[PDB]
């Protein structure tokens, strides 16, 4: 009966790039999800399969919290059945997803005058990701018949690109922080429960 460490995830000082999205597994704690739904600080809070307020009476063996930053125009891809550079090549939720997607504007932390270029996304990959896969490869993408042997050039493109967030960007181009909560149940040790 210790409380779940959501402050570690939502209020973490640093967030991951989407290609390397960070996930913390949270277990053996009590979670109150209604405080989040009424946080009013979140511009996206969409749940799939389960209900947000209704599941606060539920228990699971483990909940996973995946987190990352993308631009606002891409938050809609963090949902089942969507397509685009993020869903295809960076972070893909499954069709049978049971969980919640939570997002909020982070222009004031992750933008910098002249651009914050530390946040990257994967632009080139030969195949789409399967659900919940994480590709951190930086191999040069071979768009022609000639092997690249680690040297960038014609038909040989570095696979990650920077967002370059600037504070004067329009809302669709400003950074948004995202947390995906996944609800796991197996063999029922029941470690993460509601109040």
């Amino acid at each position: 009966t210790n409380l779940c460490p959501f402050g570690e995830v939502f209020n973490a000082t640093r967030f991951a790039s989407v290609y390397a999205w960070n996930r913390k597994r949270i277990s053996n704690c009590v979670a109150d999800y209604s405080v989040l739904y009424n946080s009013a600080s979140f511009s996206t809070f969409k749940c799939y399969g389960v209900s947000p307020t209704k599941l606060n009476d539920l228990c699971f063996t483990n909940v996973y919290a995946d987190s990352f930053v993308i631009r606002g125009d891409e938050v809609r891809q963090i949902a089942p059945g969507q397509t685009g550079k993020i869903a295809d090549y960076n972070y893909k939720l499954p069709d049978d997803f049971t969980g919640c997607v939570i997002a909020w504007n982070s222009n004031n932390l992750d933008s910098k005058v002249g651009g914050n270029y530390n946040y990257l996304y994967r632009l080139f990959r030969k195949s789409n990701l399967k659900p919940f896969e994480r590709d951190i490869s930086t191999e040069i993408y071979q768009a022609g018949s000639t092997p690249c042997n680690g040297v960038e050039g014609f038909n040989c493109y570095f696979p990650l690109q920077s967002y370059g967030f600037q504070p004067t960007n329009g809302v669709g181009y400003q950074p948004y922080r995202v947390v995906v909560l996944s609800f796991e149940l197996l063999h029922a040790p029941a470690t993460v429960c509601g109040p």
Partner: antibody, heavy 122, light 109 residues
Framework: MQLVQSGPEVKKPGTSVKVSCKASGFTFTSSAVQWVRQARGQRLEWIGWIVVGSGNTNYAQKFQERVTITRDMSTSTAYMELSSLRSEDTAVYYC????????????????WGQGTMVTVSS | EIVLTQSPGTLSLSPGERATLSCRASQSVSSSYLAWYQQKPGQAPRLLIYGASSRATGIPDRFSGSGSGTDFTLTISRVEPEDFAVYYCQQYGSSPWTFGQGTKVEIKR
């Protein structure tokens, strides 16, 4: 299939000029676009190039501070803009790209634009 | 900057003869990124050869190309009259992707 370019341009010294390359008949998203120029009766000269997918550019030092290569994938065209035009910049400007399918790209510049004549004189 | 010197400056051949143009580099260049182009006056270049060896789709069997290191050649086995034009070699392995001076293939009488 093809690459088509802007009209011809004549500009006074010190101004800018922006010519365009519209792609037709191949999956433009996955290719790259290189801009070169050629004085009348002289050799070809490499200006720069750009990666259609990522927008990253490389420029020869001759033009590092004066040329800007961009692309709009929505209309699937590329642009070369030369500012602070010198007299000696008058030439035909060609734009070239490798034709690409959904799966693979060509290992050389096979598609060439028709060229745009650009004359710089007071 | 990679310099590309072409030889000869201009060769003159009666139709049906053999043509051999050469491209030489100031230092070794990847053979995977070296190309030859045929340009006629007024027109834009046509890609003749890519990767120093491979023929561009739709270009006739007449044309061939070889070489590596610093020496590259383009060979026209039997120069049909359509083949009298300028030929430029371009490397594109190391930026800047420079060009040769071009050799002029004129017809001899």
């Amino acid at each position: 299939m093809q690459l088509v370019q802007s009209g011809p341009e004549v500009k006074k010294p010190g101004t800018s000029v922006k010519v365009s390359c519209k792609a037709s008949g191949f999956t433009f998203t996955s290719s790259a676009v290189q801009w070169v120029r050629q004085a009348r009766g002289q050799r070809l000269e490499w200006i720069g190039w750009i990666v259609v997918g990522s927008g990253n550019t490389n420029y020869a030092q001759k033009f590092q501070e004066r040329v800007t290569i961009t692309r709009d994938m929505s209309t699937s065209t590329a642009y070369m803009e030369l500012s602070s035009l010198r007299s000696e910049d008058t030439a035909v400007y060609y734009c070239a790209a490798p034709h690409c399918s959904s799966t693979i790209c060509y290992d050389g510049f096979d598609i060439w634009g028709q060229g745009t004549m650009v004359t710089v004189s007071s | 900057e990679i310099v590309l010197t072409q030889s000869p400056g201009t060769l003159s051949l009666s139709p049906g003869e053999r043509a051999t143009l050469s491209c030489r580099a100031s230092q070794s260049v990847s053979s995977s990124y070296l190309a030859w182009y045929q340009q006629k006056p007024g027109q834009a270049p046509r890609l003749l050869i890519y990767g120093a060896s491979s023929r561009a789709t739709g270009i006739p069997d007449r044309f061939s190309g070889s070489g590596s290191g610093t020496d590259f050649t383009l060979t026209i086995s039997r120069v049909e009259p359509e083949d009298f034009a300028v030929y430029y070699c371009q490397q594109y392995g190391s930026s800047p992707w420079t060009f040769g001076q071009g050799t002029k293939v004129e017809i001899k009488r």
